[PDB]
Write a protein that binds this ligand. Structure first.
Ligand SMILES: [Zn+2]
Ligand SMILES: [Zn+2]
Ligand SMILES: [Zn+2]
Lengths: 164, 107, 335, 98, 224, 84
């Protein structure tokens, strides 16, 4: 691989380096092998990076992976959108999937979208658990006949008594 | 801090939590042959004092449950001997702004 | 909406707190008592008995009268009824929960089968998701079928540490429709302890054991000491939905015709009465247990028709049947 | 085609057009007017609109009370919950006793 | 599945990104609190090139007959020579740029200089020149304190967060670190006098513009 | 839970949303024969008028920006700097 490095004079120059790509992964152990650079080892398995290098490291790999999948077709997406997704997937100190993990919701409310032919069963559990609906979703606010606290509804408008 | 070689007897393992408030930590040599915190992908983690911690929650006006989390047995938390309820300021480089500082509370 | 005026400040719903209706509350907010599971014919007089459909709840007949509140038959928020049950009854929707909870707490003193003295239990108690915790705890406690008195502490396994002063064994609870049965024994496959003691768990045992469970315990589960207490999954006082909920398709006058949910409330009350008119006039042990299950069947079918049968007998030999669980078949699907 | 489905909703959400979202999804049902206790989020308030007397027993409340407008479908959906021994407490405030 | 999972995440009034539960997902949106449609790919010059090229472009030494600003680039040109007090100011600016070069080379190990940012500085500059018909044939009327102090003052007004406490003020310095490294490389005294040939008027205009655009590029609370 | 007119950390600038809802609410009142505060120099379209009122700063409205913790800040339309 050609590597962009600062030349002794300051300007970046390409310096070739031998790199090893492997079929199979055992990060914890290969990393320990002498003669390599443990500081720069990597793997497309973000899961192993997480269990071995920590959540934060995991987040960065999870990002690099998503990024490549898109940069693969020469496409571009502002960093903030993939960064957002990667953060959601990492907030709880673990790697939570986005593809309908929970058999119930993702981050919705009981009174929200009448998912499943039986919303009643979801209501029973809510009752037996003292579930508290914040009422920030659209559907839940629809049933309540109100606009959701989103964008244009993220604030209230009141008459002013100062203007002479 | 107890650094062992291959492993410990499950019997002996249940001998750690037994001398409060003093805490005992275990490390397998293999897991120390390399300092993970010296890795590109691993940003700077800084244990915050209960003071800073209070200051942190006060300004962003947050409940402890609203802060991002980090697992107790997380490699870095294990490194800094983090204890549940403790917060770490994570100083990472950003391609958007210069630096970006995030926070994680040890679960 | 309703051109009449109201001094009450108009606002929008910001939060929705779910929970369970406690028996004390269903009483503290009721109006009537609904004793007579019938209507009209006050001495052959087609009016409205103070038993059902009008004792104090919303009215009809273009009568503004309705517990000194006025308003029309369209601007009135039906007032909820009240109806005491002779015996406790499992709520259809919670038989599954009630089963697991029973397997988590000791069926004698009501103490959790596992606590902080178990390293695997602690990892479960730490779970935040009340749903994931209840699960992780039930998976650990359903195995234990003995209420330990002394357990080895984190310290020297040599020494023990006492906890729940109770030590009786637990039953391997299994479901059989609307009832729970517990099987006892002394260690699986061993001498001088073979053969099980199978007996059905009465609604009263469960309810009373649930009342001995500490706040720390049912909170360890997804329960809330203010909105949802375990015991409340067992009904003792059923809320009677006002007429606006369950109407009455009657053309003008003379004709009766009341909603299919009122017909059910009638039969529920009936059985409840034939159950009280036995403990009063003295009755056989197995005889009462008959009405009990009957009542259960009606209280269960009312809220949710999907158990051990298809009760169809509402003023029609054709055998039709509706309920509340199956009422959103055009409400949770219309919105 | 010709429909306003889940994907059309996500779009307007990203645009931030909450009014439109509410307008396009509000069922024709009457915006019924109900009264609710500030202690219990229940519709157990007996409203005497002529004599001006709102009283909710079980809570000894006559002052701390509110008014709301919700489609009848909701009013019913809630009474059905109450009927099934489930309390759908509606609160006008977010920051509870917390 | 992507929509469903991220559907309730919104930017709140504190510049924080949170979900319906109110959990913090990002302490500031996109770690810069900026709206993506106001971001343009701009090159961070300071990072690339040889050290000589870096010094030939930014270094200003009034105490050196060969590295001062020729009197033709500025009126006070000839009397600036050997001005101890200004040089102290000019060394502050250089040390800051040299710091940035380090900092940038750490953030972009690759050495990549082109990165998307708010407020296209190059354009504001070209516009200024057109708007004020700047002629490269006359010495500017800008004082050195004008450039340095001016560029310095502007960095104090590019606001993302306004909280008066310590934590926020620090979060506010981090979120504008990169743009600020860009700014300093584009409004370095020598660049202002030797390359752009801006006048006191043109220059002053450029500053207020960057401020108006910066504030204008900030994300709006309510964004889904 | 109320925040003094001082110590407000929120933006001095109006958000595109705030402006959109203000132009929408105000236009609803104008379309309902509600009085106008700006000299109608020809305009007849309610929104077109609402916008004229926003520019001349004659809309007696106040935006209550709530913070995620429950508290809130009160900004007057007049006060808010409009530049979107
Ligand atoms: Zn009434
Ligand atoms: Zn026991
Ligand atoms: Zn009440």
């Amino acid at each position: 691989y050609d590597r962009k490095v600062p030349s002794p004079t300051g300007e970046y120059v390409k310096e070739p380096e031998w790199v090893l790509e492997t079929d199979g992964v055992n990060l914890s152990e290969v990393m320990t092998v002498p003669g390599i650079d443990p500081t720069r080892i990597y793997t497309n398995s973000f899961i192993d990076i997480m269990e071995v290098l920590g959540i934060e490291a995991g987040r960065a790999a999870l990002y690099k992976e998503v990024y490549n999948v898109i940069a693969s077709d020469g496409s571009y997406v502002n960093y903030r959108h993939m960064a957002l997704l990667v953060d959601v997937m990492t907030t709880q100190g673990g790697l939570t999937s986005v593809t309908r993990h929970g058999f119930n919701r993702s981050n919705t409310g009981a009174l929200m979208r009448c998912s499943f032919e039986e919303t009643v069963e979801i209501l029973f559990e809510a009752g037996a658990s003292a579930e508290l609906d914040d009422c920030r979703g659209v559907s839940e606010n629809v049933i309540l006949g109100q606009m959701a606290p989103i964008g244009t509804g993220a604030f209230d408008v009141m008459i002013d008594e100062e203007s002479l | 801090i107890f650094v062992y070689q291959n492993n410990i007897t499950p019997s002996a393992m249940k001998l750690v939590p037994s001398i409060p408030p003093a805490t005992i930590e275990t490390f397998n040599e293999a897991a120390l042959v390399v300092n993970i915190t010296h890795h590109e992908l691993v940003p700077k983690h800084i244990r915050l004092s209960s003071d800073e911690k209070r200051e942190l929650l006060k300004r962003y006006r947050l409940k402890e449950s609203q802060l991002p989390r980090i697992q107790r047995a997380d490699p870095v938390a294990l490194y800094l001997g983090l204890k549940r309820g403790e917060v770490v300021k994570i100083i990472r480089k950003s391609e958007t702004s210069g630096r970006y500082a995030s926070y994680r509370i040890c679960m | 909406v309703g051109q009449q005026y109201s001094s009450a400040p108009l606002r929008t719903v910001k939060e929705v707190q779910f929970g369970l209706f406690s028996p004390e509350e269903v009483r503290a907010i009721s109006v009537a008592k609904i004793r007579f599971p019938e209507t009209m014919d006050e001495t052959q007089t087609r009016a409205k008995i103070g038993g059902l459909n009008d004792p104090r709840l919303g009215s009809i007949d273009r009568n503004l009268k309705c517990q000194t509140c006025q308003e029309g038959m369209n601007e009135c928020p039906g007032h909820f009824g009240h109806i005491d049950l002779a015996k406790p009854v499992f709520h259809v929707g919670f038989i599954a929960k009630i089963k697991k909870v029973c397997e988590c707490v000791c069926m004698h003193c009501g103490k959790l089968l596992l606590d902080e003295h178990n390293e695997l239990m602690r990892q479960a108690l730490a779970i935040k998701d009340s749903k994931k915790r209840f699960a992780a705890i039930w998976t650990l406690c359903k195995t234990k079928m003995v209420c330990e008195t002394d357990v080895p502490s984190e310290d020297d396994p040599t020494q023990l540490v006492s906890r729940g002063g109770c030590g009786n064994t637990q039953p391997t609870i299994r479901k059989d429709g609307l009832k729970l049965v517990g099987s006892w024994k002394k260690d699986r496959a061993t001498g001088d302890a073979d053969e099980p003691e199978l007996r059905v768990l009465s609604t009263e045992e469960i309810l009373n054991i649930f009342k001995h469970i500490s706040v720390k315990d049912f909170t360890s589960l997804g329960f809330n000491e203010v909105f949802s207490r375990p015991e409340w999954m067992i009904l003792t006082c059923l809320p009677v939905p006002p007429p606006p909920v369950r109407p009455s398709i009657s053309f003008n006058e003379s004709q009766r015709g009341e909603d299919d949910l009122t017909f059910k409330l009638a039969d529920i009350l009936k059985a409840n009465i034939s159950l009280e008119t036995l403990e009063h006039n003295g009755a056989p042990h197995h005889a009462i247990e008959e009405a009990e299950s009957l009542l259960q069947f009606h209280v269960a079918t009312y809220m949710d028709n999907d158990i051990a049968g298809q009760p169809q007998a509402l003023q029609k030999s054709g055998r039709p049947v509706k309920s509340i669980r199956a009422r959103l078949k055009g409400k949770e699907g219309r919105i | 085609g010709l429909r306003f489905g889940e994907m059309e909703r996500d779009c307007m959400i990203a645009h931030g057009a909450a009014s439109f979202l509410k307008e396009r999804l509000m069922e024709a049902s009457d915006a019924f007017r109900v009264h609710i206790c500030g202690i219990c989020g229940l519709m157990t308030v007996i409203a005497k609109l002529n004599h001006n007397q709102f009283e909710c027993k079980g809570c000894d409340n006559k002052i701390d009370i509110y008014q709301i407008h919700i489609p009848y479908a909701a009013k019913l959906l809630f009474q059905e919950l109450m009927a099934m021994n489930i309390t759908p407490r509606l609160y006008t405030d977010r920051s509870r006793d917390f | 599945r992507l929509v469903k999972a991220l559907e309730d995440i919104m930017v709140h009034y504190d510049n924080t990104t949170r979900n319906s539960l109110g959990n913090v997902i990002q302490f500031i949106y996109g770690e810069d609190g900026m709206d993506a449609a106001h971001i343009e790919k701009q090159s961070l010059d300071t990072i690339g090139g040889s050290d000589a090229a870096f010094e030939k472009r930014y270094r200003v030494d009034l105490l050196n007959t060969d590295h001062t600003l020729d009197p033709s680039l500025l009126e006070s040109g000839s009397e600036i020579l050997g001005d101890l007090k200004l040089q102290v100011l000019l060394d502050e600016e250089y040390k800051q740029l040299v710091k940035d070069r380090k900092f940038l080379r750490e953030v972009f190990v690759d050495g990549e200089a082109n990165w998307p940012l708010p407020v296209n500085i190059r354009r504001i500059i070209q516009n200024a020149q057109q708007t004020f018909h700047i002629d490269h044939t006359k010495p500017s009327d800008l004082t050195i304190k004008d450039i340095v102090l001016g560029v310095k003052d502007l960095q104090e007004n590019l606001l993302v967060l306004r909280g008066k406490n310590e934590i926020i003020q620090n979060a506010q310095r981090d979120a504008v670190t990169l743009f600020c490294c860009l700014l300093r490389s584009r409004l370095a005294t020598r660049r202002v006098l030797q390359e752009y040939r801006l006048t006191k008027q043109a220059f002053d205009w450029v500053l207020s513009n960057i401020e108006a655009q910066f504030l204008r590029s900030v994300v709006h609370p309510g964004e889904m | 839970k109320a925040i003094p007119k001082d110590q407000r950390a929120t933006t001095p600038y109006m958000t595109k949303y705030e402006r959109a809802r203000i132009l929408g609410t105000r236009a609803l009142q104008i379309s309902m024969n509600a009085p106008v505060f700006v000299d109608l120099e020809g305009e007849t379209d309610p929104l077109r008028i609402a916008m004229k009122e926003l520019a001349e700063k004659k809309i007696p409205l106040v935006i209550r920006r709530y913070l995620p913790d429950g508290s809130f800040e009160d900004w007057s339309v007049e006060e808010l700097i409009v530049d979107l």
